[PDB]
Design a protein around this ligand. Structure first.
Ligand code: A1AR1
Ligand SMILES: *[C@@H]1O[C@H](CO)[C@@H](O[C@@H]2O[C@H](CO)[C@@H](O)[C@H](O)[C@H]2NC(C)=O)[C@H](O)[C@H]1NC(C)=O
Ligand SMILES: *[C@@H]1O[C@H](CO)[C@@H](O[C@@H]2O[C@H](CO)[C@@H](O)[C@H](O)[C@H]2NC(C)=O)[C@H](O)[C@H]1NC(C)=O
Ligand SMILES: *[C@@H]1O[C@H](CO)[C@@H](O[C@@H]2O[C@H](CO)[C@@H](O)[C@H](O)[C@H]2NC(C)=O)[C@H](O)[C@H]1NC(C)=O
Ligand code: NAG
Ligand code: NAG
Ligand code: NAG
Ligand code: NAG
Ligand code: NAG
Lengths: 48, 129, 96, 439, 96, 48, 48, 48
């Protein structure tokens, strides 16, 4: 298996843990929920 | 520190500031903190020939060892190091032109660091029962 | 952070091809021969094989280039069972 | 109306309900050093900032006036709490904490200067330990900025960038002493904050004024006192769960922390310049172009300060309004009972009490709450004897044992009609029920 | 704004440029229901918004509290009620 | 505009707070209108 | 084009800042008026 | 000369916006003070 996908210049929300490892990420322009996650700079935005 | 991998030598905060690094030669790791920055709260009375200085939230040892040495008398108040004022918090004043915060005042005759008590109860010696 | 990243929700394409003896000429045309554009992100399965219970690692080799003629540099990323040989040379690439 | 009577649900039993209300009377006294915020330590920035002249003098002056308004407001609130308070020197809160079966031990801190700063009630202690950034909280947080700790407190970064919250002129311990004095002034003689009469009698007369006969009140005094201290306990236990008043108190600290953090984030905005860092600009460009980039940062940071100062002026206007409302509630709900229906909380307001809270005052409004109701036929007036009209005072006329009697509007207790519970008229209005046999 | 109207509403230009007025959390119809409930609460039992007594008696006691004897006040009840409804009609006609 | 940083976030945040104050105020006015209101279930708009 | 667009961004952001400052000031008067209206409801309609 | 005059225009206009925002806040306080004065006239002078 050799899965490939195109790359492009995109803005991402990168979350780093207490040891410097990227544990989670969000593609900001991918969907409406991703836009809320990037706007609030959090993986689980507050109810609103 | 244990978070630096083989290719990493700089630690950054969420704002893009350098806050730590690993020395390329000695491999020793250090945290970088900003140098102290602050203000001096100076209390002045027109009849005085000097000032009462308050280094807010700073111990007098810190002021003398890391900011500046001086010949003025000093003491550690609740609000921070106070210079050129006598510690007289046991005394109180109902009016105060130099209000320093948390019920403290600077009173000039020298300057006195005194408690500020603008209001008090009218007392009577009548029975409670 | 802004960088060269995949589009979330887009589709990966499994371009790996396994053959035994015969090679199809259609394997060397579109859509397998793909445009590079800005770049690509690859998720590669490490096909762990065993001979006399001894582990061996195999996966598809990728070539990146333009015309694939010795007038041009072709980058090649090829595994050698734990060693990833990466070269960029004026190779005489084969038709197939 | 059947004949001349209407159907009304009159209470047959009641309880006392306590309601909290936090009124913000103060806010953190934010000070900006405009020079240190805009330019940090960089001489090339300070030279240019001098050419903007009076912009930093305006930022400093407007915030000094705003902080002066907050200090004047705090003195006015303290003056209001202590206005007319007279206490006996024989009063010792360690032994004197309950009277007439009503317990104020939780609402009263130690009294007198021998305690020092310990003049805070159990109620105020329980309300202050849930808010980290109170006046003492800010002082302790700023004290830790030079403690050499590896923890990067956001308040320390803000203060090093010239953004520091100063303590109020009166500590929250002094204000708790003033609320304690105002509270004991209602429990013991001379009762200077309880209409000059015992607290239980003031509660009884306030409940009677709602239309409740005094006969049930002076025999259910134990039940009234137990309902009153149970309402107080319900208020205290309400802070251990999601509470609207505690959330309102925490919103003051959260909104201030959000505004200060938002102001600090302006130091990382590029404002169209090559970098948000003055060190990077000065290490990449010479004076002819570095000054252009530094001027972009100066305009952006000064614009951010003018926006923050406009927001602070608006917020302090809301705090002055809230402090005026709190002073009015002290005077017209705690020290006295003004004839205004829903001013001191909702419902049949009996009486109110006050306690100190972070950046404000917490009022406890006690109301007469009906438990069970009886549907009865009432007459709003009667035509008696020689066509003389009578109207009931804070009650209704009732046919009890086929005889006209009076009952209070807030408690069903039929009692004989007399001049004590009647308004007389020389002529009776139309539709007043005819009763020639009365009086 | 999305209709096939030839009329250029200035609000549509504002909304397309990012400036828009959102409706309040409670519709004005709900507030009208609340003001209606507050008004009928004074007319009929239990008169929860009229001191617990009939509205006409509340008007009569309020006028008496100004220094008007109850005799002329209860003998002129229809004149007072007609003056009250004429005042209400005058307020309604004043909007024209 | 992305190089200006938090300017548009500040404008949206201040307007959202202002609108939250208007919403909270409208709820307080509605609560005040409805406070202590008791009506009979027998009330009819077409008869009374 | 960046120089020209930057002048427009600065003007438009300054205009939004001015409008937001005016909106905060006007909502303070609206809150004051709503408080007066709640007080008039309680002390003129529900009671005298 | 246009470049230098533009710097002065932007500074003078920025200062005029700051003064206008301060004036709006101060007049809101004057309106609150006048409302309190009218209440004191009506409830302390003309009546008690
Ligand atoms: C891209 C693709 O579709 N790839 C599949 C491949 C091709 O369809 C086939 O190569 C095309 O051929 C053309 C172009 O002519 O088929 C595979 O499967 C075969 C059966 O389809 C496989 O079982 C083989 O079967 C044999 O009968 C035979 O020779 O094909 C005997 C041989 O020993 C045995 N290979 C072994 C033992 O690996 C394979 O492998 O080749 C699985 C691959 O995923
Ligand atoms: C500092 O740390 C680096 C990384 O571990 C050390 O570099 C390694 O040194 C060994 C011995 O020469 C080599 O086998 C590795 O290949 C080196 N790794 C890299 C990434 O260069 C370095 O020796 C350390 N130096 C000191 C003074 O501690
Ligand atoms: C400043 O003055 C106060 C008041 O005299 C000092 O506090 C007292 O300290 C003594 C011990 O020396 C205690 O017995 C008292 O109970 C304290 N009183 C109070 C009100 O706390 C204080 O220690 C002095 N501080 C310095 C640094 O001189
Ligand atoms: C009536 O007076 C008595 C005597 O002063 C009061 O009785 C005390 O009440 C407290 C509770 O507040 C009890 O803990 C004491 O033990 C009681 N003492 C005695 C000697 O009985 C009583 O509370 C007063 N009641 C009222 C309603 O005024
Ligand atoms: C200051 O000096 C003036 C003039 O001698 C005098 O009126 C005033 O009372 C003095 N105040 C103090 C605090 O010394
Ligand atoms: C309040 O304190 C001051 C200073 O100790 C004193 O002059 C004043 O007389 C006190 N108040 C009363 C009511 O005695
Ligand atoms: C109270 O004070 C007055 C005035 O000094 C004195 O006459 C009286 O005897 C005192 N009474 C008590 C119980 O201390
Ligand atoms: C009143 O209500 C309480 C709680 O339900 C009850 O304990 C008490 O006995 C009741 N009293 C009367 C007179 O109904
Ligand atoms: C201040 O520092 C001390 C010692 O590290 C710590 O115990 C305390 O919790 C800190 N308090 C605050 C408010 O930072």
């Amino acid at each position: 298996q050799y899965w490939v996908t195109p790359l492009s210049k995109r803005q991402y929300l990168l979350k780093f843990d207490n040891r410097g490892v990227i544990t989670n990420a969000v593609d900001c322009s991918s969907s409406f929920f991703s836009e809320i996650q990037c706007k609030t700079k959090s993986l689980l935005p507050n109810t609103g | 520190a244990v978070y630096y991998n083989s290719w990493q030598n700089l630690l950054y905060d969420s704002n893009g500031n350098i806050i730590g690094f690993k020395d390329f030669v000695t491999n020793k790791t250090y945290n970088i903190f900003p140098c102290y920055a602050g203000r001096v709260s100076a209390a002045f009375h027109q009849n005085a020939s000097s000032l009462a200085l308050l280094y807010r939230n700073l111990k007098c040892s810190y002021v003398l060892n890391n900011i500046s040495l001086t010949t003025q008398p000093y003491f550690d108040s609740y609000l921070g190091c106070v210079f050129n004022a006598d510690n007289l918090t046991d005394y109180s004043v109902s009016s105060c032109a130099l209000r320093m915060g948390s019920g403290f005042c600077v009173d000039y005759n020298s300057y006195r660091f005194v408690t500020f008590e603008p209001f008090n109860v009218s007392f009577v010696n009548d029975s409670i029962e | 952070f802004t960088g060269y990243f995949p589009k979330s929700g887009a589709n990966f394409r499994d371009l790996s091809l396994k053959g035994t003896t015969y090679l199809s000429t259609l394997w060397y045309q579109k859509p397998f021969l793909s445009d590079f554009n800005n770049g690509i992100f690859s998720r590669v399965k490490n096909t762990k094989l065993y001979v006399n219970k001894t582990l061996y690692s195999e996966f598809s080799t990728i070539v990146i280039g333009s015309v694939f003629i010795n007038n041009s540099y072709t980058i090649v990323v090829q595994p050698h069972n734990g060693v990833l040989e990466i070269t960029a040379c004026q190779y005489t690439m084969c038709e197939y | 109306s059947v004949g001349g009577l209407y159907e009304i649900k009159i209470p047959t039993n009641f309880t006392i309900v306590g309601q909290e209300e936090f009124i913000q009377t103060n806010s953190p006294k934010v000070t900006i050093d405009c020079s240190l915020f805009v330019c940090s330590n960089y001489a090339a920035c300070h030279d240019l900032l001098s050419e903007y002249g009076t912009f930093c003098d305006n930022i400093n002056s407007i915030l000094d006036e705003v902080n002066g308004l907050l200090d004047t407001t705090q003195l006015h609130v303290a003056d209001t709490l202590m206005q007319g308070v007279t206490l006996s020197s024989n009063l010792n809160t360690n032994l004197h904490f309950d009277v007439d079966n009503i317990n104020f031990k939780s609402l009263v801190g130690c009294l007198g200067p021998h305690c020092g700063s310990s003049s805070r009630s159990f109620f105020e202690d329980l309300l202050f330990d849930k808010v980290k950034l109170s006046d003492v909280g800010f002082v302790e947080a700023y004290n830790n900025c030079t403690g050499g700790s590896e923890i990067r407190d956001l308040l320390c970064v803000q203060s090093f960038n010239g953004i520091k919250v100063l303590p109020p002129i009166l500590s929250e311990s002094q204000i708790s002493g003033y609320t304690t004095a105002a509270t004991v002034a209602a429990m013991f003689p001379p009762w200077s904050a309880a209409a000059g009469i015992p607290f239980s009698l003031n509660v009884q007369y306030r409940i009677n004024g709602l239309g409740v006969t005094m006969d049930v009140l002076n025999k259910n005094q134990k039940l009234i006192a137990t309902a009153f201290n149970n309402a107080l306990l319900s208020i205290q236990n309400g802070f251990s769960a999601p509470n609207s008043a505690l959330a309102k108190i925490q919103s003051v600290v959260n909104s201030n922390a959000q505004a200060l953090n938002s102001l600090l984030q302006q130091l990382f905005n590029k404002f169209g310049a090559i970098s948000s860092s003055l060190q990077e600009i000065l290490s990449r460009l010479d004076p002819p172009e570095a000054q252009v980039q530094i001027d972009r940062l100066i305009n952006g940071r000064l614009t951010a300060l003018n926006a923050y100062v406009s927001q602070q002026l608006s917020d302090i206007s809301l705090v002055k309004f809230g402090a005026a409302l709190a002073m009015e509630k002290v005077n017209e709900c705690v020290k006295s009972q003004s004839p205004r229906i829903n001013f001191c909380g909702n419902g049949n307001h009996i009486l109110s009490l006050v306690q100190n809270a972070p950046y404000g005052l917490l009022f406890m409004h006690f109301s007469y709450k009906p438990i069970s109701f009886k549907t009865v036929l009432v007459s709003p007036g009667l035509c008696i004897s020689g066509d003389v009209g009578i109207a009931p005072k804070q009650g209704y006329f009732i046919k009890h044992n086929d005889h006209w009697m009076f009952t209070g509007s807030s408690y069903y207790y039929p009692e004989p009609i007399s001049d004590k519970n009647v308004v007389f008229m020389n002529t009776c209005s139309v539709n007043f029920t005819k009763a020639p046999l009365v009086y």
